[PDB]
Amino acid sequence: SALGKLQDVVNQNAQALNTLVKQLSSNFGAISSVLNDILSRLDPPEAEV
């Protein structure tokens, strides 16, 4: 664990990417977190919201 700053930067970047991926799989107050299933289930006029 001699190289602390480089490992810390790499871990911070990895955590940022992981949080971005997790937020990608979030609902944000919707029916689902995927768009294809929403388009297949609902119609555009009601799925636009």
Partner: protein
């Protein structure tokens, strides 16, 4: 049955074509929440209830 003793039928292993139900000119109100009234044949539900 009435509303206090509403029945519940766990329908499974079913082949559903809801196009004949929506296009019947008999149903007055078809408020179809959660899923669109059309584009329903392109789905495959796990288990339904009536």
């Amino acid at each position: 049955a009435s509303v206090y003793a509403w029945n519940r039928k766990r329908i499974s292993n079913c082949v559903a074509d809801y196009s004949v139900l929506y296009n019947s000119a008999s149903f007055s109100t078809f408020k179809c929440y959660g899923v669109s009234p059309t584009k329903l044949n392109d789905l495959c539900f796990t288990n339904v209830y009536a």
